[PDB]
Amino acid sequence: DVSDFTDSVRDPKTSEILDISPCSFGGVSVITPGTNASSEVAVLYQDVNCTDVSTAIHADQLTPAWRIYSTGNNVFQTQAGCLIGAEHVDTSYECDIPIGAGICASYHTQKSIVAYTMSLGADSSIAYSNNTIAIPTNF
Amino acid sequence: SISITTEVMPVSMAKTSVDCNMYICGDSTECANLLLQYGSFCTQLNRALSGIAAEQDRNTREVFAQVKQMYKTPTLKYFGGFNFSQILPDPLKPTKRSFIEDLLFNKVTLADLICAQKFNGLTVLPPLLTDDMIAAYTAALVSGTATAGWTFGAGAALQIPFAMQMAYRFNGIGVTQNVLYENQKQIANQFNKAISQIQESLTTTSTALGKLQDVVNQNAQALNTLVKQLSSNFGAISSVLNDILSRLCKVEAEVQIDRLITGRLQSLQTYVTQQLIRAAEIRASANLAATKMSECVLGQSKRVDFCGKGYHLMSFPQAAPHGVVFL
Amino acid sequence: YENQKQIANQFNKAISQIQESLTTTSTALGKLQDVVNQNAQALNTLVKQLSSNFGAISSVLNDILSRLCKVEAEVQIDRLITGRLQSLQTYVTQQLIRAAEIRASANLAATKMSECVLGQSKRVDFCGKGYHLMSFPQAAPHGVVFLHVTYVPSQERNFTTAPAICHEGKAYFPREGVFVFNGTSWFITQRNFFSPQIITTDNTFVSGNCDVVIGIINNTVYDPLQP
Ligand SMILES: *[C@@H]1O[C@H](CO)[C@@H](O)[C@H](O)[C@H]1NC(C)=O
Ligand SMILES: *[C@@H]1O[C@H](CO)[C@@H](O)[C@H](O)[C@H]1NC(C)=O
Ligand SMILES: *[C@@H]1O[C@H](CO)[C@@H](O)[C@H](O)[C@H]1NC(C)=O
Ligand SMILES: *[C@@H]1O[C@H](CO)[C@@H](O)[C@H](O)[C@H]1NC(C)=O
Ligand SMILES: *[C@@H]1O[C@H](CO)[C@@H](O)[C@H](O)[C@H]1NC(C)=O
Ligand SMILES: *[C@@H]1O[C@H](CO)[C@@H](O)[C@H](O)[C@H]1NC(C)=O
Ligand SMILES: *[C@@H]1O[C@H](CO)[C@@H](O)[C@H](O)[C@H]1NC(C)=O
Ligand SMILES: *[C@@H]1O[C@H](CO)[C@@H](O)[C@H](O)[C@H]1NC(C)=O
Hints:
The structure is cut from a larger assembly and holds 3 copies of chain A.
Chain A: E1 8-10, E2 17-19, E3 28-31, E4 42-46, H1 53-57, H2 64-67, E5 75-77, E6 81-84, E7 87-88, E8 97-100, E9 103-108, E10 112-117, E11 122-124, E12 132-138
Parallel strand pairs in A: 7-10
Antiparallel strand pairs in A: 1-2, 3-4, 4-6, 5-6, 8-9, 9-10
The complex binds 2-acetamido-2-deoxy-beta-D-glucopyranose (8 copies).
One 2-acetamido-2-deoxy-beta-D-glucopyranose (NAG) binds at residues 49, 51 of chain A.
């Protein structure tokens, strides 16, 4: 290739063509509350579709402690990638640990790591009328 | 006459991270052992890149998040003859952006090149705030300006009709209140005409958003230069790390490998230094954008040529790819 | 002057709240600790990097000279010299960039001291949230702390308003303020505070007939005459 890395090789016996590719995919991020409160973590594989995560990690040849972070009931799919080790919630809070793409994570309540959509702000509405005004009376 | 002029300012750039061990020694155990002898050099670049990424998120947040409540867009886009429909989201169309923002998002083109970056440890992380969230912020700012005026910046929102707001804004530049009320419809027609001209100018192909494409181009060139520099042998017998280990002995192979290690380390150092300088420039631009949003959207400014050519009346923000556009 | 003592009590109360907030443990001064931490980490990294051998036989300079000859010892020493030179160059480049950032922050602090302590500023949110009144500087380790006092409007009320009134075919516009309807009659008030005044000839001015202004109401204007 342009990086002087060989990618395709011809078998000297069968004259077929084989593609060699790196056995290390892209980035892995670890989300931790801190090792002063607990010892569980969440794992984010970014730019990886979580349907086929086990192919990208080769979890068959890892430790059994690495297989419980490969699939389960705690699988979430965000625009960043696939997040394993956290529970999805529907309420929105202020951002604590920024995962990305609008998704934040925190350590809520026995405590567990939760992932949610960040809250932009408080919701308010003021009515527009063409013949009324609001004037302060105190300060 | 009433004139609407546009100003484009960059806010953030792309956040990138580099895996040092897989950039320098790709899947090589011997090169990994020789790399540990260079202690605490790969951990010094990740700290700098993490600082840059956190700075980018801070830039975007502390420019755009300036209101403490979110205002719903009104059902009526006609405030006393002034047509606000082009700069507010359209309920019937299922996009969460205004029309001018839709034009702005098409004039900047964000995109075996990305795959080679991915295979060598170069990764681009997504921004924390998505485009819909920034669109929500700008819609809240425009709605608050149309319905409340200058008061919501300094505290809670105080309702006022739009004509009386324009009367105060004419008082602020030295023209009495009656001049607005005598010929209000002429001013409304000029406002609508200038909005239409801005729309027409943005529609046609131009280079008005050239300052935003140059950020994207420079980051792409830097990352491609890192990918391309891996083919240099740096004075060694070859640039392939697996051919030096196939026909040489340990004492004579370590001497050849160390040259490649030093060359790739100093290439990656050049990249991180250039990124730090460019990040400083982007931070200065974002600080100016934040103070412009504070002093020209939440109020009226008497500084000369700070917010356009003429006497400033009021101003509107719009979102753009990695940037902001002030009208 | 009407309610000076209420303002004095609010000033003293806010000073006490600032004192109470600074007393308890917090991270309000976190921007000043991060300067100290970064410089310490950089200097410790320079100290720690002296143990790398940079591809030579050893990182100790006195062991290469105890078991090697001149031609073969200079080759090993030059690698250490180059590695330490480029480490020290990395340190000085990082220091230059950090110094530029600190200089920009200090320039902003100087202009803030000039425009908010020696005067009053009309720039929005330049010196706090609200309308700026006055400001005080305090010294901090490698930094400055500004206390801005601000006027915050409160307790809003609803009123019915009009752009102008006309008495006898002549439109009257307010000079400073707005026309409001308390429920009985029409008064003129300032925008920021509610203090109603009687519509009079001195605080209004006349412009044309009342057939072009959109939304004009009819009323009476007091004149200071008729003795
Ligand atoms: C051996 O190499 C030849 C190439 O000349 C190939 O045709 C053949 O299939 C290979 N294998 C055997 C078992 O002969
Ligand atoms: C994952 O794959 C599905 C189809 O197999 C596709 O629709 C989806 O966009 C993919 N996700 C990502 C993040 O690429
Ligand atoms: C403003 O509120 C305070 C509450 O502490 C009250 O004591 C004061 O009388 C109010 N101002 C007026 C003008 O009533
Ligand atoms: C506002 O402008 C749009 C086109 O930009 C137009 O369709 C709409 O009718 C206008 N609103 C009016 C005239 O009230
Ligand atoms: C003012 O009137 C509007 C509309 O009638 C109402 O929504 C709002 O709550 C009122 N505010 C006060 C302080 O009375
Ligand atoms: C204005 O209306 C308010 C409504 O409560 C009333 O209290 C006040 O006395 C009125 N002012 C007059 C009649 O001057
Ligand atoms: C205010 O709006 C109402 C309803 O749209 C209208 O009847 C009235 O004439 C308007 N008043 C003005 C424009 O002064
Ligand atoms: C005010 O009264 C006069 C009486 O001469 C009338 O001509 C005018 O239309 C009135 N204005 C209104 C009802 O807004």
